Every structure is written in structure tokens, then in C-alpha cells.
Design a protein around this ligand. Sequence first.
Ligand SMILES: C=CC1=C(C)/C(=C\C2=[NH+]C(=C\c3[nH]c(/C=C4\NC(=O)[C@@H](C)\C4=C/C)c(C)c3CCC(=O)O)/C(CCC(=O)O)=C2C)NC1=O
Ligand SMILES: C=CC1=C(C)/C(=C\C2=[NH+]C(=C\c3[nH]c(/C=C4\NC(=O)[C@@H](C)\C4=C/C)c(C)c3CCC(=O)O)/C(CCC(=O)O)=C2C)NC1=O
Lengths: 492, 492
Amino acid sequence: MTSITPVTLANCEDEPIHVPGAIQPHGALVTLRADGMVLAASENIQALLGFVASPGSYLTQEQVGPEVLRMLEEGLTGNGPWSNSVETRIGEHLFDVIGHSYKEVFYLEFEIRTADTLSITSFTLNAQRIIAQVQLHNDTASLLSNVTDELRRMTGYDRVMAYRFRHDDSGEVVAESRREDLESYLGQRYPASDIPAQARRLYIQNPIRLIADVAYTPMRVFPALNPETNESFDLSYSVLRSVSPIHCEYLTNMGVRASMSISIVVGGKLWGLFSCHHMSPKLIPYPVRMSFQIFSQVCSAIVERLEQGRIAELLRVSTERRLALARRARDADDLFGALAHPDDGIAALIPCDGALVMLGGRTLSIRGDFERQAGNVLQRLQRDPERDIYHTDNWPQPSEDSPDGGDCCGVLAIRFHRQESGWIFWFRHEEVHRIRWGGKPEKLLTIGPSGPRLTPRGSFEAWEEVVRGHSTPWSETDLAIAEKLRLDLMEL
Amino acid sequence: MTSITPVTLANCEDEPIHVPGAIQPHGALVTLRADGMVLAASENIQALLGFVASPGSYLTQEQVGPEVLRMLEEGLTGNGPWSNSVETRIGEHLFDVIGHSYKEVFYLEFEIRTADTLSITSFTLNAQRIIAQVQLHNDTASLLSNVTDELRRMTGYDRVMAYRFRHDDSGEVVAESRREDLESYLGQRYPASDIPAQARRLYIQNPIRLIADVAYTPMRVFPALNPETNESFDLSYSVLRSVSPIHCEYLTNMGVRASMSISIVVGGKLWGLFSCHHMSPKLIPYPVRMSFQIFSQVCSAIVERLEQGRIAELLRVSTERRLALARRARDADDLFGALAHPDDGIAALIPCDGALVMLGGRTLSIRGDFERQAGNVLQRLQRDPERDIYHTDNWPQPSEDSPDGGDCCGVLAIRFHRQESGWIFWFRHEEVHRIRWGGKPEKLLTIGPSGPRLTPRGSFEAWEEVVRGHSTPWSETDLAIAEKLRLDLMEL
Ligand SMILES: C=CC1=C(C)/C(=C\C2=[NH+]C(=C\c3[nH]c(/C=C4\NC(=O)[C@@H](C)\C4=C/C)c(C)c3CCC(=O)O)/C(CCC(=O)O)=C2C)NC1=O
Ligand SMILES: C=CC1=C(C)/C(=C\C2=[NH+]C(=C\c3[nH]c(/C=C4\NC(=O)[C@@H](C)\C4=C/C)c(C)c3CCC(=O)O)/C(CCC(=O)O)=C2C)NC1=O
């Protein structure tokens, strides 16, 4: 046999999950050349479809029937990306046949329709009403909160969570709906490393991902290498694509047996994800998944609009505050009274855990005590004094050699008056300190061979270790506001 | 009984089509008060549902079943607009019960499902494929044409057209798909009076309008007036709402027996409309219509994005063209040689049928002879020598008493040099004359008692009458470009 790489926690960061060479046993995959010649098929193809797709053969009406052949021929003879489906009866079972093409290869996926058509119609209507009602939401928090409960009410999943991804791709459960006896994961954080770059790519490219059974045994696709090119078949868009063994073990530790997740894509990146988890196997009919795929596209457009609105509104309000303060600084009797004003001062321009004003030897801390942090920052800046703007989200925490210390892990500053040490500072506390007061998801469970990290506790500890000593970073909005404020203060 | 106004061409522009007091016989309508008390019901309620909804009574589980009552209870107890539907078997038929509330009145519409779950699932999948595929179009013309052909392929309508409404609400068939034996209406124009303000409002508020059989006899609603307010029930959102007698006459003259239309709303105004016509009665199942309602919302958002992109691109191109012209005029030895350039002159900045350059007593016409027309415009402007910018879209056509005259219906004039009579003019020919180059959509048909205006040719003649002597008006973008050109030439 060829070489094989064992998937372990040390190498899973680069696991080739897009080319597993196997599919979930709830369906069968047929791979076809651009001329319709069968390149490879699944080992269970004879079990599900009752016919053998011998490589090098061509499909016939005796095998897949006329509807599948007409769909396929319309695909092979078409131009550009192809994606279609048809219903057909093969043997006794009714199969949903999904067709698509990728990297010049054509795929046919035979999925048994186990649910009744009446339920499929009702479930489609409910999904379509989500698609319609989601346009009425005024804010993304309301949207995610309402959609999570409506998605659970419709699908009946034991748990539904909405994830929102932060600047570093770390996940956060921002909304939840769950069975009464289930442990709540609301507010849990987990590191970006829990969803490898390849998985994030797949979540961005494919709007819906479904795992019918985590305890499944993959069915192989033979040959594993493409007969024409010595490379594995790229199953990136396959609906039946196998699951990584590590994610299976992770979900297994949580007792999750099935999952379905709906991606939210904004600006070409995975902005959020509705993830539905079930404690027992659960299949969602293909027409309903297609309705959720349209929901994903619509909700992504709505969330993009709502985020653009929220950003524009924050820029408007910030500009109004900035102009009001820039005027008052000249109009007021004292620049400290203006800048340090509890509501109209600089502390209201950038969301911060405190601020400090320094000018002509004068100092004043806002919402805290930051005099020594500013002093140490200046002592560091003295090694590179031409920095009129300074930005850090990872100020080094000092050793126990001093009782006073840099508890403000983040510092942002502006030198508005070089002549008299005119400095403006914004401070933020550790991103762990900003959350630890809310508790932690730490629990103990029966755990598989890979150990405790494949559990929500281990995931949260790994996040805590990643953001340890780091404050929430200054976004491009904050940096823009800071530079604009300096440009305004350059006149004063 | 109260008097009833006869709907005729003299008063049809004021017809209150939103309160017809009747519905189409393919379904039944029940009106309810906010407490669930029956206010009024359609005279066919017994024929379809098997029970009588006597005003003042309450619906019981024996009449409509628990599903309808649970949905209604949720609607009556919910806060804000309500809209939901459920599938239920009432008497001998399976119904799609659509519930909604308007002006504090609750309505229940029972529609018999004529198709099985199969076929409906396939039709819904096809509609969903359109919804997904329409996001791949990069231009509005390609979108409208492809959607028109795919909508015809799915629905099987004898004809499908895409109307695009203009600044004066006039319509134009910009795309068509039709049966081999059907007469083509591509490029037909019709006046705004063909769709009164109330019909436009309803097409904006309700994304789907269906007419199952134009030859139908409306089923009246009794009582005719709301017992709580003594006013007619507002059916603006009802899907069974009756059709005006005059549009039934119009479609009867066209030989059309059924119609379905999908609205395209951009900026809160009816931007366009896909209309499907059938030569025989045709019903579209409710789940499929809800799929097309989501298609209408998605298509409206896509068309809005595409039109915004096209407008921004036109502003970019116009800016570059204006700057290029200014540079060439600065580098050219003779300003006339640059301004009269066929590809980079004033004729390239604004869509026009002709232009004229005048300066220091020099005159030069572009794309034809406009010297005497410009002379007459100056004669009109000489009455107000302070007018530096003038535009008109209804230039009075001179009589036959002169061999030459103002043969231009549109005139846009700008003065860039008061001392040197520096003037720029753009001219546009009659809109009818502009269309006549593409053919004449006129034919004769059998006509009804309202006479020839309720025919496609009658609508074309009425449009010709409405735009006679008028050119396409100068839009805000054209005026902005013209003003910027004026300022740039003043700088030069
Ligand atoms: C309380 C719950 C909880 C969860 C579910 C969580 C993380 C999380 N993993 C996700 C997916 C994947 N993760 C890995 C691989 C790795 N898994 C690891 O743990 C490290 C060692 C590792 C690589 C270095 C792969 C291949 C996939 C793709 C699976 C596929 O679809 O084939 C997702 C996506 C959405 C979802 O599944 O709900 C989430 C949200 N964190 C928590 O606290
Ligand atoms: C060759 C084809 C062709 C067409 C189809 C055309 C006109 C046209 N009428 C439309 C609708 C309506 N018109 C009127 C009323 C008036 N109709 C008139 O003729 C004058 C007298 C009048 C009032 C003063 C009303 C109440 C409705 C609403 C009907 C309802 O209840 O749903 C539409 C919408 C789309 C559609 O119907 O497919 C179009 C496109 N003009 C053409 O050349």
C-alpha cells in the first residue's frame, strides 16, 4: 500500500480533510470524467444502488435511469459551474440525486429520502418563513437570538447555538437554545485552532455541512487516486464528505451524535455559524437543506447590511462626539475639563477600560489609575521617540520585582502636543480578565484516547492560554478615529 | 342597499381595487376580529369548507381543526404583523391555509392544493435553484433574460415577460419568452395609466399576484362593511383579492386566461415586474408561490445592487471622460476641435441625438444640423438673459408655416461664456421617433365593450399620445454632469 499519515493533535492543524477518499455511509458517490466515464465509486454503491459502477464504464438507463442521465448530460455538455438535482427511484428506495462538478470532475450523490414528502413540504415552508421573517430584524443580536430559537423549534435539534467569530477567528456562543437537561455553553470561548484553516475554507465555500452520525464508519472510494492524474479526488463540495477522526472524537466526548451547521459569510469570511447539535443520529432532507442554503445566503446578506449599518452609525456618533470635543477644547476653560469629561471626553470616543491625559507635566487618570503604565510606555518610546502614535495590544506584564505593574495589557496613545509632553492614552484590561468573572465551561467527562483537549473545557483552557496577557485589540475603526483625532488636535 | 359606481374608462383611474368586497372563487376567505370573532366570510365558504362562519361566532376545532386554531391563536396573541400558513385537511380537500392581519383585522384564506407532494417538491427545488443561480448574474439585462427563460421553463407559462418601468411609470417589455405560435410583444410600450397608482401600490406591497382565471365571477364578502368601523374591508394583502373588471376585459382581449406576476421593488418603488401569461386557467401551488416570493425579495436585492453598480460605474466613466476632454481641450490648439470630437466631445458625455457648440460668434453643429433649433432656443432665452442653464423636454413643435423649425423635442442648454456667447446644447428626438427605428408593435384584435383602448395596440397608441412632442427627460445625473462640465469649462 501507499504511505499513510496518522491524524493526531500534533498534525491536525494541516489535515487534508478535503480529500478523505471516503464518504459517510448514508449515501453513495459516483465520480465521472468529463466524457461521462465512471472514474471511481464507493464500496457501498452495490449495497445502496444495486448496480456496480465498474471504473471505465459508462452510466446507462439500466443503472441510474433516464432522469439522472438527462440531468448529467445537461451538466457535462453545459459550460461553467454545474449544480443540479433530481428525484428518482432506484430499486425499492427513492433517491435524491445531487449533481455538481469540481476541477473538471463530475459527481453524483445518491441520498435515500427517508422522510415523508408531507413533512418535507411543511419543513420547507417553515424554513422559507425564516427566510422571510429574518428581513424584519433591526439588529444582529436580535437576529441571532430569534433565529436560534426558530431554527431549534423547526429542526427539533437538541441544541442550537449561534457562533460569532472574533478578529482572531476565536469562537463565541452568542445565542443558544437547548433541551432543558442539556448543559448550557452560552458565552463559551474557544480558539481558532479548533477549526483549522481548511475547515474554515470549506465552511466559507459550502453553505451547509451535515453530519448524520458521528459514530459512523467511512465508506471508501476506489480508486483513491484519480485514474487520469495521480492525485486524490477533491471532494470539497461533496455533501457526503467524510468527517475528520479528531472532530468525531471531539463530538463523541460531548455525546454529540449528529450535527448540522449553517454558515454566515460576510466580506468573504466566515462571520458566524449556526451550529445544531443532536445527541442521536439525525438526517435533514435535501430539499430542506437547500432551503437552509438559501437562508444562509439571505441571512448573510442581511447580516452584512446590518453590520454595515451598525458600523456607519458608530462612525456617525463617533464623528459627532469627536467634533463636539474638538470644539469644546477651544471653547472650554480647560483642556483637561474637555478631554477628561466623563461623557463628552476622549473616554467616550474609543471603548476602553480607562484613559489618561498628560500635558505640560499635568496628569489625570480616567475610570482608573494608569500613571505608571504611561510612564513606562514613555520610557519604552524614548527608544523610538518619533512614534507620534503608539499602539499595543500585548504590553508585557512585569515580573514580581515591583508591586505596581502593567495590568493594562493594551495601550494606545497620541502625542497631540510635542512641545509639552501632550499625550492621550487609552487602556484596556486583559481579554481573559474581561471574561473570567462570568465563569468557565470547565467540567470533566469520560474522554477518548486523544485526551482532555477534545472537550469544551480543554478548548476553553486553550483559548485562555492563547489570549493570556492580551487585551482586546484596537480595530481599524479605533485606529481611524485616533488618527482623525490627532489630525484635528494638530490644529489646536 | 347603497349605490355602486359602475367601473368605466372615465373613472377607472379612481377605482378602489384594494376594497373590492369579493374574492376569486379558487379559495375561501374568513375575516376575524382581534378576539377571534368572525366579522365576515365569503359566500363560497360552505362550498369549499363545509361549514358556515356566521358573523359573531367563533371558529371551532370541529370546523377547521386544531392546526388552524393553534396558528390563529399564535397570530392573535402575537405582537405586530402576523403571517403564517399551515397544511390541513378540511372536509374532502387538503388546504393551504394562509393567515395574515391588516388594519387590526385577521384573515384566513383556504386554498385547495391541486397537486401532490411530489411535483411540488421538484417545482420548489427548481425555484430554489433559480434563487441560487440569480446571484451569479453580473448585469441586469442578462438577469432579466435568463430569469424570463428559466421561469418559463419551470412554470410552463405560454408567455413570460419582464416589464421595466421608466421615470414616467410607462412600461416596456424588455425580455420575453413565448410559445412558438404566440405573437411577440417584445419592445411594446404602454402608458402609466395602464397601471393606476393603486395597482402600483399593491404591486409594491404584495410581491406575488395571481389570477387563476380571468373569466371568473367574483365571490362577494358579506357583510360588505366592517361592523366595527362601517368601512370596507381592506384586502390589500389578500392573495384571493378580486381583479378589476377592466383588467379582466383587457386580458380577455389579449386571449390571456390566467396571469402570475413577480414584482421587483427597488428603492421602495416598482422597478420592474415579471409577468407570466397563460392562454388557459393555471394555478400555482402556495409553497411554490412562497418560493417565488423569496425569489422576488432576492431578485429585488440583486437588481438593486446591480443598478447601484451600474450608476456608480457610469459616474466613474463620465468623470474620466470629462477630465480627458478637459485635458485634450487644454492641450489642443482649437477648443472646437476638442469639443467636437465624435468620441471624446460633449456628445460622449451625455446620451443624446445631437449637440451644438457655440462660442465668440462661431457655431458648429454635432451629429446633424441644429443651428436653427439652437437659434430658436436662444430666441427663447433672450427673454431672460440671466439664465445660464436651461433645459426642456417638451419643446413646442412649430407648425407647417415654416420650412425649418425646432424639430427637436428635448433641449438642454448651458452657457459657459456670457461675453462670447459660449453655449452648449444637447438635443433629443421624440421618444416615438426613437422607438420607430426598432419596429411597430401594433396589431388588431377582437374588442370588448370598452373599445379599442383595452388592447395592446390601444395602449401603444395611448403611450404615443402621452409622449408626443416629448423627449426622454434629462435625469439628475445628466444635469449633474452638465453642471460639472460647465464649471470645468469656466475654469478652462
Ligand atoms: C462546545 C462545543 C465546541 C465546539 C464544537 C468547538 C469547536 C469546533 N470544531 C469545529 C470543527 C472542526 N474541528 C476540526 C478539527 C479540530 N478539532 C479540535 O478540537 C482541534 C484539535 C482540531 C484541529 C487542530 C475539524 C476537522 C472540524 C471540521 C469538521 C467537519 O465538518 O468535518 C467546529 C465547527 C462547527 C461544529 O462542528 O459545530 C467547532 C465549533 N469548540 C467547542 O467548545
Ligand atoms: C401587451 C400587454 C399589456 C399589458 C398587460 C398592459 C397593461 C397592464 N395592466 C396591468 C395591471 C392593471 N391595470 C389596471 C387598470 C387599467 N388598465 C387599463 O388598460 C386602464 C384602462 C386601467 C386603468 C385606468 C388594473 C386595475 C391592474 C391591476 C390588475 C389586478 O387586479 O391584478 C399590468 C400589470 C401586470 C399584468 O397585469 O400582467 C399591465 C402590464 N399594457 C400592455 O400593453
